[PDB]
Amino acid sequence: SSTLTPMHLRKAKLMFFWVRYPSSAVLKMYFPDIKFNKNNTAQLVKWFSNFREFYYIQMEKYARQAVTESELYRVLNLHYNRNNHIEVPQNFRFVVESTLREFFRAIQGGKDTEQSWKKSIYKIISRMDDPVPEYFKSP
């Protein structure tokens, strides 16, 4: 079918633990049950953009906290793994800590008052995607 469902949305969120910047090609490989077209492809792609938005908002918030001075993972896990179906992968943790460090350095260094200060961070994180587990391909 060409219609995205709540199940696809739930699956997409779990996949975020491996891929923050999946290409259309990646998405097609892992969603073999969908007949991709311009509309649903963009719709699926938009979801990961939403996922990243929430992710970075949380990353910056926590980093500012640290500077101004467990819950973070609870927040991330509730959002992307509500029913706690999967174990948070170690590589996601490394990406989270790496992201926090990028924001922490920037904020602590007062670089957050510069234009495009978050771009250098996105670049770094976009290179840290992990291959999506093959089991995600199973119905």
UniProtKB/Swiss-Prot annotation:
Source organism (scientific name): Drosophila melanogaster
Name of the gene: pros
Domain Prospero-type homeo span(s) in chain numbering: 1-59
All residue ranges annotated as the Prospero domain in the record: 60-139
Start and end residues of each stretch annotated as Homeo-Prospero: 1-139
Included range, full protein: 1545 to 1696 of 1703
Cellular location(s): Nucleus; Cytoplasm, Cell cortex; Cytoplasm
Family according to the record: Belongs to the Prospero homeodomain family.
Site, as annotated: Interaction with DNA: K38, Q43, K46, W47, N50, E53, K119
Function: Homeodomain protein that controls neuronal identity. As a transcriptional factor, regulates the expression of ftz, eve and en in a subset of neuroblast progeny and modulates the transcriptional activity of other homeodomain proteins such as Dfd. Required for proper neuronal differentiation, axonal outgrowth and pathfinding of most or all neurons and their precursors in central and peripheral nervous systems. Regulates asymmetric stem cell self-renewal together with brat.
This protein's domain notes: The Prospero-type homeodomain and the adjacent Prospero domain act as a single structural unit, the Homeo-Prospero domain.
Disruption phenotype: Embryonic lethal, results in the aberrant expression of the homeobox genes ftz, eve and en in a subset of neuroblasts, and in axonal outgrowth and pathfinding defects in both motoneurons and sensory neurons.
Protein name in UniProt: Homeobox protein prospero
